[PDB]
Amino acid sequence: IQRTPKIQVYSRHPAENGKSNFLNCYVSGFHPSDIEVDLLKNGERIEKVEHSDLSFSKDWSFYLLYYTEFTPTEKDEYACRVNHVTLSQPKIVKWDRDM
Amino acid sequence: IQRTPKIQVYSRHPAENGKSNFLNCYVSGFHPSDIEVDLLKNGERIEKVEHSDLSFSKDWSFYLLYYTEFTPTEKDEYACRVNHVTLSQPKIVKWDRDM
Amino acid sequence: ETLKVLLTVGNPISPNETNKQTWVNKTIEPPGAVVKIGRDTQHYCTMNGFTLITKVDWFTEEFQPSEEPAPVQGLMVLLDNHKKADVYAAQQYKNPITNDKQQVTSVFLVRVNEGFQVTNHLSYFYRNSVNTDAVENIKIRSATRHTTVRFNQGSWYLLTSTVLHTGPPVSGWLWMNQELQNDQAYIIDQGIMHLITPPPVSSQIYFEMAT
Amino acid sequence: ETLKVLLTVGNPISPNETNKQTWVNKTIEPPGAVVKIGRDTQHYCTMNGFTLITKVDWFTEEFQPSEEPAPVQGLMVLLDNHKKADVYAAQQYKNPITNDKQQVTSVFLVRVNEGFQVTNHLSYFYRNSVNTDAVENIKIRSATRHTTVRFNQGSWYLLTSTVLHTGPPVSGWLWMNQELQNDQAYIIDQGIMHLITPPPVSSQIYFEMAT
Amino acid sequence: LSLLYHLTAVSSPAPGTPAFWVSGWLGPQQYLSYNSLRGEAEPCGAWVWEVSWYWEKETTDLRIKEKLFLEAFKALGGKGPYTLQGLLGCELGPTSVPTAKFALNGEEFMNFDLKQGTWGGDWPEALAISQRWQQQDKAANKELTFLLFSCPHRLREHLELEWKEPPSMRLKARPSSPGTCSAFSFYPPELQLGQGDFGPNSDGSFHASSSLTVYCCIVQHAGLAQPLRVEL
Amino acid sequence: LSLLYHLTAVSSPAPGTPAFWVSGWLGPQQYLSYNSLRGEAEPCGAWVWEVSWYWEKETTDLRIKEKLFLEAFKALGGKGPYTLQGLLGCELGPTSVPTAKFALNGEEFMNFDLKQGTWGGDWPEALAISQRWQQQDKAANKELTFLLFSCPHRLREHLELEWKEPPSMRLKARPSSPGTCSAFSFYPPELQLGQGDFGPNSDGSFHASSSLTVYCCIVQHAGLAQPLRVEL
């Protein structure tokens, strides 16, 4: 089968300007496992990025977390660019501070 | 076919106590034409009764009018007793003054 | 004799369309404006379903290629006291509903000998849904659209009539003239399986009929 | 080879009853809790309709008394990765719906070799009514009741699956695993005519199938 | 308006009851009566007041219709009861519109075709009765003359009906369940007001009564210049 | 709780990407990692802090699973791409409940029957792979020992998880169309609040966020003694 990835963008801690924090792009429920994910600062690719092990849920759909250590400000925009087989166009999901 | 008779009881003129008037028992929409109808004063058969010719409407169901010359009072009850093939029990329809 | 039949469904008769609800005649009056099938005045029924048939394959009880039989003598399709079609095979299905009411559906395979059109009060079956295991029945809409239905000379048609009979079950063919009943449960039976949505064009429908 | 078949309908499988709506499986998951029919993991479909058959009459293309054939090699009915029934004949019906979506219904005549029961999310088709000539479609309830359906060893069953395929029409047998779709129009076709209300007991249903 | 004849025959009339009776109408008014017991065409209503050739001709015509109507029961295989009803008449078009329909035991089964000058019908009952009437001397010929010439001309002569009568009005409140507009003695019968019903009076007028489940009532009639309100 | 292993193999991995990787879990926490590129069973999270026989035994076991998972692709007729997923583990019943299911290209097609000590399935793909694994030396024997003895005993040993972490709460009002309650860094993942979603954090905690189309928010978590309200 083939399934599209559900993408969530959220921070480890509530966002305060100036303090160090973590940014998470949780991609879940996709199949097959082949997936390409980037974290973006102002539309540019962040190179310091770590991702957890690729696992799967009870329906055999893969989930995996991309995270980076970042310092939020009110002029910096963050987003997650995800590309998959079920996507002829890669999706970019902007980061809302409170979600 | 067989059809049950619709029975209406009404007076020619608006009912005033003491004045002579006419009482009508319009039986319509029944089939076959064999029908037995009586006009009742206090549950007893009125003998002075006239009925019009037996005709039929556009659906070939018979209609016919039974009428008598009577003087209404507030202590006299009038009704119409109709018996037909479609009726294992003859129906008695009391006369409401305003209908 | 019992003949098994394979009816090749043609195009839907207007106002029926390919992927819409099937419209069937509902009312049975005025008597001259409706299609009647029967022997005499005390033995007839009024059609509800009409379906064009483009090819008929004839088989016997023993399933062998049979030739088109003669019309059953006596049965006819009439419009305003005038015969317009011959009946070649027929079958009646009886199925109990409430232990004192049975759904009786009569199915006639006819060939129109003289083209005609009628203007009847049509309707369609429907069944609502509820979020419970409660029973939902199939009923007629109880509303009617007045529209023309046309039948062509030389064409073959499948006509159906469905009535609800109260009392003890009847033995032998039941003749009964009755419109489709409002707020009354119906079950799809052997005779009205093709009256929900039109059968696909050139698809085949099977019957076991008497002649 | 093409075999024509006469299926004698038995009693409704619980929770279906004689004069109620027909309940069919709707969901296709969890995969081990639903009935699957197909060749392999990339070629199978999940059943919706189930109907007990008490007698099967076999005929060839030339309509002659045929003997019960061997199961079609490869096709099987499985529950949780275990084969529970053999398929003896099958047929697939394709009918266009929206010029880019087709309703594809697969009908399988099976014999259960090992008794089993499932607990599925059932539903029934329905069609609302309006006082207009507007089109009313047939849809699934979109609500489900979780209940057990039982299949017995040695019995014969008629299993159906209906999916909606988007794109160009497919040639050859289409294998597709898909639940019944909410708020989606369906038309009763050659494969689901018996899934509105249960066919009368001992009545016969006809098919033209491949083996 | 119209000139219509209501023909009725019964195989088993009640004792002291005609087996075949006729009523003649000119619109909503009845002018002619006939039955097998009397055998006479008799005037009704205001038409009683004036010649003799007209009523003598009608009496002989209705006797022939009586013979054919009773003959129809014999044409059918004898198995009672039977009821033959006939609707013969016409209307004065801008021309004429004839009407000729017959019903057996309440079931419409026959007419009189105007192209082929005979009684039309393919029911097994309409093929036997139409035969028997055709097998009578000049029976079909007279019917075609009546439906196409005699009835339309007789209607034209009479038009060389207009009497009006306003309806007395009453509105009363009955004891409605926890939580009636009637009109008396009006003519012509055309009148508009819920669940109204309609019926005639012995004098030739009409009576209507509509009640709504509950305000004033409105009545429109040809005897009233303008619609009139009704008060409790 | 549970001790589960997520096995995954791909016929065509991306460049610099393992063709077979494993994740070991004790409930919601991952303790083990493995992949074909490294070939080593490595600790995760707080489990990195302490013996060697246990991890050495796991590394050899996961290498055998790697050989069989790649062998499964050969058992199927070569036509890529392929994805083999496996779910092996158990739970400590009041006893034990084993789990052994496999999926081919996302389709569940096989298990490990405990009565007949082999891999069960009647699909044409499950008859070839279960054969090939059975055709390997003592492969089925070890699986039965793991699902029924090794996994339950290993869970009993570890129970001789309890760490709590209350969720930081925030409630904000976004520009709703003309006319969001989130919890950060909580553990255990069980937590209740509209259209909530749920996801993990890199540190092992969890994050949830529910927003209702419009008021206070209620949160219940194992780290909180009693449910706590939330204010804007």
DSSP, residue by residue, A9-62: EEESS---TTS-EEEEEEEEEEBSS--EEEEEETTEE-SS-EE---EE-TTS-E
Shortest CA distance to D39 belongs to which of D13, D71, D67, D73?
Answer: D73
Residue E24 · residue E5 · CB < 8 Å: yes
Distance CA D18, CA D38 (A): 30
* Neighbouring C-beta atoms of residue B47, cutoff 10 Å: 8
Residue among D31, A5, D164 at smallest CA distance from F106: D31
Q: Which of residues 33-52 of B touch E (CB under 8 A)?
A: 33-34, 50, 52
Q: Report CA dihedral (E49, E50, E51, E52) to the nearest 10 degrees.
A: 30
Residue F127: both structure tokens together: 């008859």
For residue F112, what are the β-bridge partners?
Answer: F119
Q: Per the structure, how many domains does chain D have? A: 1
Q: Phi/psi of residue C189, each to 5°?
A: -120, -170
Q: What is the CATH number of domain A1-99?
A: 2.60.40.10
Q: CB–CB of D126 and C129 under 8 A? A: yes
> What are the tokens at C43?
């033995």
Question: What spatial distance separates the first Cα and last Cα of chain A, rounded to whole Å?
Answer: 31
> Which of F169, F187, F167 has the alpha carbon at shortest distance from F232?
F169
Chain C contact probe: residue of E123, E127, E129 with most C CBs at under 10 A: E123
Q: What residue spans define the domains of chain F?
A: 1-162, 163-231
Contact B13 E197 (CB under 8 A): no
Contacts of residue F212, defined as CB under 8 A and 6 or more positions apart, other chains included, come to: F181, F194, F195
Q: How many CA atoms lie within 13 A of C36 on its CB side?
A: 29
For residue A21, the distance in angstroms to the closest alpha carbon of chain F comes to 11
- C-alpha E70/C-alpha F17 separation (Å) is 105
> In chain D, whose CA is at the least distance from the CA of F106?
D41
Cβ-Cβ contacts under 8 Å for C119 (sequence gap 6 or more): C33, C146, C147, C148, C149
Cβ atoms of C59 and E144 within 8 Å: the answer is: no
Q: How far is CA C185 from CA A68, C101, C136, C160, D123, in A?
A: 65, 11, 9, 18, 20
Query: Which residues on adjacent β-strands are paired with residue F219?
Result: F228
Radius of gyration of chain C (CA): 17
How far is E87 from B81, CA to CA, in rounded Å?
30
Rg (CA), chain F: 22
Q: For B24, name the nearest residue in chain E, comparing CA atoms only.
A: E201
**Neighbour count for residue F229 (Cβ, 10 Å):** 10
Dist. CA F204–CA F223, nearest whole Å? 15
- Using DSSP's 3-state secondary structure scheme, residue E130 falls into helix
Give the three-state DSSP class for E182.
strand
Task: From residue C170, give the alpha-carbon distance in Å to each of C38, C159, D31, F7.
Answer: 17, 22, 49, 68
- Nearest by CB: F21 against A3, A53, A98: A53
Please give the C-alpha separations between residue F6 and each of A57, C145, F26, F65, F70, in angstroms, as whole numbers: 9, 63, 12, 11, 15
Is the CATH code 3.30.70.1730 the one for domain E163-231? Answer: no
Query: Pairing relation of β-strands E191-192 and E118-120?
Result: unpaired
Are E107 and C41 an interchain contact pair (Cβ–Cβ within 8 Å)?
Answer: yes
Residue F197 and residue A12: Cβ atoms within 8 Å? no
Contact B56, B70 (CB under 8 A): no
DSSP lists the bridge partners of residue D65 as D59
Angle CA B22–B28–B32, to nearest 5: 130
3-state secondary structure of E149: helix
Resolution reached, in Å?
Answer: 3.0
Pairwise CA distance, residues B59 & E108, whole Å: 9
* CA–CA gap between residue C193 and residue C138 (Å, rounded): 12
Domain range for residue D53? 2-210
Nearest residue to A25 (alpha-carbon basis) of A80, A69, A88: A80
Among D142, D158, D207, which residue's Cα sits nearest to residue D12?
D158
Burial environment of residue A50 by CB neighbours within 10 A (0 to 12, 13 to 18, 19 or more): exposed
CA separation for the pair D166, F152 (Å, rounded): 48
- In a 3-state reduction of DSSP, which class is residue E143? helix
The helix or strand, by DSSP H or E, that contains position E59, with its residue range, turns out to be helix E52-75
What does DSSP assign to residue C162?
E
- Give me the DSSP letters along C4-45: EEEEEE-SPPTT--TTSPPPEE----SGGGSEEEEEETTEEE
Query: What is the Cα–Cα distance from A32 to A29, expressed in whole angstroms?
Result: 10
Cβ atoms of F183 and F166 closer than 8 Å: no
Show which residues on chain E lie within 8 Å of chain C, measured between beta carbons.
101, 104-105, 107-111, 120-126
Cα F54 off chain centre by = 20
Q: Do chains E and C touch (3 or more CB pairs under 8 A)?
A: yes
Between CA D123 and CA F54 the distance in angstroms is 52
Coil, helix or strand for D206? strand
Specify whether domain F1-162 bears CATH 1.10.8.60.
no
Closest CA to D177 of D4, D38, D21: D38
> What per-residue string of b and e applies to A71-84 under the rule 16 or more CB within 10 Å gives b?
ebeeeeebbbbbbb
Per the entry, the structure determination technique was X-ray
Is residue D37 within 8 A of residue D76, CB to CB? The reply is: yes
In angstroms, the separation between the Cα of residue B58 and the nearest Cα of chain E is 9
SS3 for E146? helix
Q: After which residues is chain B broken (C to N over 2.5 A)?
A: none
Contact in structure between F206 and F221 (CB atoms under 8 Å): no
User: What is the number of residues in chain D?
Assistant: 211
The three-state secondary structure class of B21 is: strand
Residues 6+ apart with CB under 8 A from F82: F9, F10, F11, F72, F73, F76, F104, F105
Rounded distance between C-alpha atoms, residue E91 and residue E1, angstroms: 6
Integer angstrom CA distances of residue C90 from A6, C5, C187: 60, 11, 20
- Rounded to 10°, the helix F126-134/F52-75 angle is 130
Distance CA F181, CA F211 (A): 6
Show the tokens assigned to D62: 């030339």
Question: Could you write out the three-class secondary structure of chain F?
Answer: CEEEEEEEEECCCCCCCCCEEEEEEECCEEEEEEECCCCCCEECHHHHCCCHHHHHHHHHHHHHHHHHHHHHHHHCCCCCCCEEEEEEEEEECCCECCEEEEEECCEEEEEEECCCCEEECCCCCHHHHHHHHHCCCCHHHHHHHHHHHHHHHHHHHHCCCCCCECCEEEECCCCCCCCCEEEEEEECCCEECCCCEEEECCCCCEEEEECCCCCCEEEEECCCCCCEEECC
Residue of B46, B10, B6 lying closest to B27 (CA atoms) = B6
Helix (H) or strand (E) holding E210: strand E206-210
| CA angle (F187, F191, F193) in 5-degree steps | 140
In 3-state terms, what secondary structure has residue C49?
A: strand
Are F123 and D42 a contacting pair at CB < 8 A? no
Residues from chain E that touch C42, judged by Cβ atoms under 8 A, are 105, 107
Rounded CA-CA distance A83/A38 in Å is 9
Q: Collapsing DSSP states into helix, strand and coil, what is residue E196?
A: coil
Query: What is the C-alpha radius of gyration for chain E, rounded to an integer number of angstroms?
Result: 22
- CA–CA separation, A18 and C123 (whole Å): 72
CB-based contact F35:F44 (threshold 8 Å): no
Classify residue E28 by burial, with Cβ atoms within 10 Å: 0-12, 13-18, 19+: middle
Neighbour count for residue D103 (Cβ, 10 Å): 24
Residue B69 touches partner E, C-beta closer than 8 Å = no
Of B22, B24, B60, the CB nearest to E103: B60
Identify the H or E element spanning E72: helix E52-75
User: Under DSSP, is residue D79 helix (H, G, I), strand (E, B) or coil?
Assistant: strand
Domain segments of chain A: what residues?
Answer: 1-99
Residue from B6, B56, B94 whose CB has the most chain E CBs within 10 Å, to mutate: B56
Place of tokens 């991309």: A66
Does residue F130 contact residue F110 with C-beta atoms inside 8 Å? yes
Starting at the edge strand found earlier in the chain, the sheet holding C145-151 runs C24-25, C116-123, C145-151
For C79, C89, C148, F185, F224, the CA distances from F165, given in Å and listed in that order, are 85, 81, 75, 7, 8
d(CA D105, CA E107): 47
Nearest chain F residue (CA) to D30? F108
CB contact under 8 A, B10 and E21: no
Nearest to C87 by CA among C122, C37, C36: C37
Over the Cα atoms of chain A, what is R_g?
14
Tell me which H or E stretch contains D93: strand D83-96
Contact F4, F25 (CB under 8 A): yes
Cβ-based contacts of A28 with chain F (< 8 Å): 199
